[PDB]
C-alpha cells in the first residue's frame, strides 16, 4: 500500500494565480492583467492584482510547505516579470525572484518543478499577434533559453506548457479566458503553435543539457464514458476521447495529428512546416497529467454528433464530478497507447465551499475524500503498471480561479484575503499525514 521510497508528493500552484505583485519590481503586463480590468469577464469583477501576495509572501509560504512535509512544490513562473517588453531585455529582478524562490526550496529539501507556461503570456508576445503567430513559438524558446541558462540545473524537474488545449478552448473558442477571442476556427492553428513552442523549447533545454535535470509538458485530460453501451454513444465517446485526450499526446508522441483533429481544423496541414512534426515530437522526459474530473458523452443527430451529458452529483463546488476510478482509467489508458513513459500527476484537486469555524479552524471532509479516492486510485495505477513519478495536489492555496475569481477555493491551506493569514485546512494535515506514511493509512 506504500507508495515507492522517493515518491514525489507535492503541491502545486501558478504565478497569476497567487503572486500579487502585478506592477511591481519592472513586472510588464500580462494578457491576465488586460483581461481582468474588461468589465463582465471575472466574477465579483476580481484579478489576480494581489492574490495571495506570494511574490512577497514567499518566504511565508516557504515555511507552509516545510511544514507539510513536501517533497517537491510546482510553481510557475510570470514570462513578463522576465521580459517585461518588446524589448525582448531581461528584467533581473524579475528572475531574481525565481532564483530566491528556488534556493529557498533547496533549503527546505524542498524539489523545484517550474512551468514555463500557465497562461500568462506578456501582452509584448500578444502585440506581436500571441499564438496564432509561428514566431511566438520562438519568442517561448528564447525565453526558455534564457530561463533554463539561469536556473536549470537547480530545478530538477521543467514543464514547458500547462493545459495547451484550455488555451485552445477557452482563449481562443469560447473567449472565457484571455485573451478572449471566440472563433472556433483558429484552435489548430494555435494548438500547432503552442506544439511548435513546447518543441522549441525542449530543443533550447536539449542543447544547455542541465546537470541533473529533466523536461516535459502538463496536459488535462477528463476520462470519456458513453452514457450507455449503445454503439452510436459508444462511437461518439471514442470520437470525443480522441479529440477531448489525444490532440495534443497524438503529435507529442507519434509525430502526427489524429483523424478527429484534422477533421475538426481541415486548414491544421497549412501551418506545418517540414520539419516541425519532427521537432514537437522529440523525446520528452516524463509527461505531466492534470485530471479533475471525467467527461459523460452521448451520440447526437445534431452536428457534432456529440453531446455532453451534465452530472447533478456527486460534484464539487465547480459542478466536475468526483469519480476517482477515471484517473485510474486515464493512467492505464496513456501507458496502454502510448507506452510506460514517466508521468507525475501535476494537478488533482477540488473546490468545495470551506469557512473557519467559531474557533477558526478551516475542517473540509469533502475535501479529504477527494484526495483518499483520487490517491488511492494513482496508487492502483502505478501497482498495475503506470510508471507514476509523483503527485501533487492542487493547490497548495486557495487562490484565483480565473473567470470564478476567489469564488472558488482549491487550497489545502485556507487564505483570508482581506488580511493573507494562512490556515492549514484538515486536508493539508491529512495529507502531511499521507506523505509522511508515504501513502493511504
Given at each position: 500500500?506504500?507508495?515507492?521510497?522517493?515518491?514525489?508528493?507535492?503541491?502545486?500552484?501558478?504565478?497569476?494565480?497567487?503572486?500579487?505583485?502585478?506592477?511591481?519590481?519592472?513586472?510588464?503586463?500580462?494578457?491576465?492583467?488586460?483581461?481582468?480590468?474588461?468589465?463582465?469577464?471575472?466574477?465579483?469583477?476580481?484579478?489576480?492584482?494581489?492574490?495571495?501576495?506570494?511574490?512577497?509572501?514567499?518566504?511565508?509560504?516557504?515555511?507552509?510547505?516545510?511544514?507539510?512535509?513536501?517533497?517537491?512544490?510546482?510553481?510557475?513562473?510570470?514570462?513578463?516579470?522576465?521580459?517585461?517588453?518588446?524589448?525582448?531585455?531581461?528584467?533581473?529582478?524579475?528572475?531574481?525572484?525565481?532564483?530566491?524562490?528556488?534556493?529557498?526550496?533547496?533549503?527546505?529539501?524542498?524539489?523545484?518543478?517550474?512551468?514555463?507556461?500557465?497562461?500568462?503570456?506578456?501582452?509584448?508576445?500578444?502585440?506581436?499577434?500571441?499564438?496564432?503567430?509561428?514566431?511566438?513559438?520562438?519568442?517561448?524558446?528564447?525565453?526558455?533559453?534564457?530561463?533554463?541558462?539561469?536556473?536549470?540545473?537547480?530545478?530538477?524537474?521543467?514543464?514547458?506548457?500547462?493545459?495547451?488545449?484550455?488555451?485552445?478552448?477557452?482563449?481562443?473558442?469560447?473567449?472565457?479566458?484571455?485573451?478572449?477571442?471566440?472563433?472556433?476556427?483558429?484552435?489548430?492553428?494555435?494548438?500547432?503553435?503552442?506544439?511548435?513552442?513546447?518543441?522549441?523549447?525542449?530543443?533550447?533545454?536539449?542543447?544547455?543539457?542541465?546537470?541533473?535535470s529533466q523536461m516535459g509538458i502538463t496536459l488535462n485530460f477528463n476520462t470519456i464514458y458513453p452514457v450507455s453501451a449503445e454503439p452510436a454513444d459508444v462511437e461518439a465517446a471514442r470520437r470525443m476521447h480522441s479529440f477531448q485526450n489525444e490532440l495534443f499526446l497524438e503529435p507529442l508522441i507519434?509525430?502526427?495529428?489524429?483523424?478527429?483533429?484534422?477533421?475538426?481544423?481541415?486548414?491544421?496541414?497549412?501551418?506545418?512546416?517540414?520539419?516541425?512534426?519532427?521537432?514537437?515530437?522529440?523525446?520528452?522526459?516524463?509527461?505531466?497529467?492534470?485530471?479533475?474530473?471525467?467527461?459523460?458523452?452521448?451520440?447526437?443527430?445534431?452536428?457534432?454528433?456529440?453531446?455532453?451529458?451534465?452530472?447533478?452529483?456527486?460534484?464539487?463546488?465547480?459542478?466536475?464530478?468526483?469519480?476517482?476510478?477515471?484517473?485510474?482509467?486515464?493512467?492505464?489508458?496513456?501507458?496502454?497507447?502510448?507506452?510506460?513513459?514517466?508521468?507525475?500527476?501535476?494537478?488533482?484537486?477540488?473546490?468545495?465551499?470551506?469557512?473557519?469555524?467559531?474557533?477558526?479552524?478551516?475542517?473540509?471532509?469533502?475535501?479529504?475524500?477527494?484526495?483518499?479516492?483520487?490517491?488511492?486510485?494513482?496508487?492502483?495505477?502505478?501497482?498495475?503498471?503506470?510508471?507514476?513519478?509523483?503527485?501533487?495536489?492542487?493547490?497548495?492555496?486557495?487562490?484565483?480561479?480565473?473567470?470564478?475569481?476567489?469564488?472558488?477555493?482549491?487550497?489545502?491551506?485556507?487564505?483570508?484575503?482581506?488580511?493573507?493569514?494562512?490556515?492549514?485546512?484538515?486536508?493539508?494535515?491529512?495529507?502531511?499525514?499521507?506523505?509522511?506514511?508515504?501513502?493511504?493509512?
Amino acid at each position: 500500500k506504500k507508495f515507492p521510497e522517493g515518491f514525489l508528493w507535492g503541491a502545486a500552484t501558478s504565478s497569476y494565480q497567487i503572486e500579487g505583485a502585478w506592477n511591481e519590481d519592472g513586472k510588464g503586463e500580462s494578457i491576465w492583467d488586460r483581461f481582468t480590468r474588461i468589465p463582465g469577464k471575472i466574477k465579483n469583477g476580481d484579478s489576480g492584482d494581489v492574490a495571495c501576495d506570494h511574490y512577497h509572501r514567499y518566504e511565508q509560504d516557504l515555511d507552509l510547505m516545510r511544514q507539510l512535509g513536501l517533497k517537491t512544490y510546482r510553481f510557475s513562473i510570470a514570462w513578463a516579470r522576465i521580459q517585461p517588453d518588446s524589448s525582448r531585455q531581461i528584467n533581473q529582478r524579475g528572475l531574481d525572484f525565481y532564483r530566491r524562490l528556488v534556493e529557498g526550496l533547496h533549503k527546505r529539501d524542498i524539489l523545484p518543478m517550474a512551468t514555463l507556461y500557465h497562461w500568462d503570456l506578456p501582452q509584448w508576445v500578444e502585440d506581436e499577434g500571441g499564438w496564432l503567430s509561428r514566431e511566438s513559438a520562438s519568442r517561448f524558446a528564447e525565453y526558455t533559453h534564457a530561463l533554463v541558462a539561469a536556473l536549470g540545473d537547480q530545478i530538477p524537474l521543467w514543464v514547458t506548457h500547462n493545459e495547451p488545449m484550455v488555451t485552445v478552448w477557452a482563449g481562443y473558442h469560447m473567449g472565457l479566458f484571455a485573451p478572449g477571442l471566440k472563433d472556433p476556427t483558429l484552435g489548430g492553428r494555435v494548438a500547432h503553435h503552442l506544439l511548435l513552442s513546447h518543441g522549441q523549447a525542449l530543443q533550447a533545454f536539449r542543447a544547455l543539457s542541465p546537470a541533473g535535470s529533466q523536461m516535459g509538458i502538463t496536459l488535462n485530460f477528463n476520462t470519456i464514458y458513453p452514457v450507455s453501451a449503445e454503439p452510436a454513444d459508444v462511437e461518439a465517446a471514442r470520437r470525443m476521447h480522441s479529440f477531448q485526450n489525444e490532440l495534443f499526446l497524438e503529435p507529442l508522441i507519434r509525430g502526427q495529428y489524429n483523424q478527429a483533429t484534422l477533421m475538426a481544423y481541415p486548414n491544421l496541414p497549412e501551418f506545418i512546416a517540414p520539419e516541425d512534426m519532427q521537432t514537437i515530437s522529440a523525446p520528452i522526459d516524463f509527461l505531466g497529467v492534470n485530471y479533475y474530473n471525467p467527461m459523460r458523452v452521448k451520440s447526437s443527430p445534431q452536428p457534432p454528433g456529440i453531446e455532453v451529458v451534465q452530472v447533478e452529483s456527486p460534484v464539487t463546488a465547480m459542478g466536475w464530478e468526483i469519480a476517482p476510478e477515471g484517473l485510474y482509467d486515464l493512467l492505464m489508458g496513456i501507458t496502454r497507447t502510448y507506452g510506460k513513459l514517466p508521468i507525475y500527476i501535476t494537478e488533482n484537486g477540488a473546490a468545495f465551499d470551506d469557512q473557519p469555524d467559531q474557533s477558526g479552524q478551516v475542517n473540509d471532509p469533502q475535501r479529504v475524500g477527494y484526495f483518499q479516492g483520487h490517491i488511492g486510485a494513482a496508487r492502483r495505477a502505478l501497482a498495475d503498471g503506470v510508471d507514476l513519478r509523483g503527485y501533487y495536489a492542487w493547490s497548495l492555496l486557495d487562490n484565483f480561479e480565473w473567470a470564478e475569481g476567489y469564488s472558488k477555493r482549491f487550497g489545502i491551506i485556507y487564505v483570508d484575503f482581506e488580511t493573507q493569514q494562512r490556515t492549514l485546512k484538515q486536508s493539508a494535515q491529512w495529507y502531511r499525514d499521507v506523505i509522511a506514511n508515504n501513502g493511504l493509512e
